[PDB]
C-alpha cells in the first residue's frame, strides 16, 4: 500500500495473509472456513494466517491454518487477468473474535464515489522496496467506468473496476494482490493489477466481487 | 559452474495489459536486484530497453 497509514488494531478483522515461504498475497475471510483472494495468488500449498497486525512480531491473536482446498476461478485468464479470483477452504474453522471475523459479500455492484478501505502488507514505495511490518490501510474512492477505461484502454473487463486517485501517490502495490477492498461493510473488490503503483492516471484495478456472488456460495456449498 | 553453465534466463510474461499482477513472487535478476515478480521485470526491461535476465527464482 503506497501513501496509506498503519491500520488501527481491530479495524480490518477480515484481513488474512497467504504464505508459501513468505508473505506473498492477502485475502478476506468471507466464512468461518473460507478465504477469498486473487487467482494469480494460486499456489498448490498455502498457509493462511489470520489476526496479524505486525507480520514479523507475534502479538498473540494469530491463527495459522493450512489450506485444505485451493480453487482458482475455473475461467481465470492469465493473459487478461479476467476472473482474477480464488477460494481457499481452511483445513479448520477460524475461531471468531474481535481480531478475526468475516466480511459480507456485496449486495449490489460498486457505486462511483463510494469510499472504500484497502489493506495489505505490499510495497509502500512506488520506487524501490519498502515492505512494512505493520498492516497498511488506504481510503480511496470507486472511479467511474469512463475514468477506468480511459486509464487502461480495452483492458478493463466487466469483471474489473478501478479504485484510487488519477493524481497518483496512493494505491495498492506488489504484495497486496488478493487483499480486500471494503466499501460500506461489503467486499466489493480484490486487489488484482495495475500499471506500476501510485502512477498518475494509473489507479489500481480490482476484481469486481459482485459478479462472483453466485459462484462463491455455490462452490462453498459443494465443498462443505 | 563456469560462465555458460551459470547463464540467466529471459523474463517470460503471459499478461498483455500494460501493467502487472500485484502478487509478491520475487525473482533475482543477473543485476543482483530482487524484482517483486516476473511481470515487473518484463515491464522494466521493455520500459528502459534493458536485458536483465533471471539468475533464479526468489530474492537475490
Author numbering:
A (entry chain A): 24 to 247
B (entry chain C): 20 to 79
Q: How do the authors describe this structure?
A:
(1) The serine protease inhibitor Kazal type 1 (SPINK1) inhibits trypsin activity in zymogen granules of pancreatic acinar cells. The inhibitor assumes a typical Kazal domain structure with a reactive loop surrounding a central α-helix. SPINK1 binds on top of the TRY1 p.S200A active site in a substrate-like manner, creating an interface of almost 1000 Å2.
We solved the crystal structures of TRY1 p.S200A bound to SPINK1 WT and p.N34S at 2.9 and 2.1 Å resolution, respectively. The structures of both SPINK1 variants are mostly similar, with small differences only present in the loop orientation of the p.N34S mutation site. However, due to high flexibility of this loop, side chain conformations are poorly defined, and changes are unlikely to translate into functional effects. Asn34 or Ser34 does not directly interact with TRY1. However, the neighboring Tyr33 residue engages in a cation–pi bond with Arg101 in TRY1. By comparing both structures, we show a slight tilt of the p.N34S variant’s α-helix. While we show minor differences between both structures, they do not translate into different binding constants or other functional differences. However, our crystal structures prove that both SPINK1 variants are mostly similar, and the minor differences we detected are unlikely to translate into functional or clinical effects.
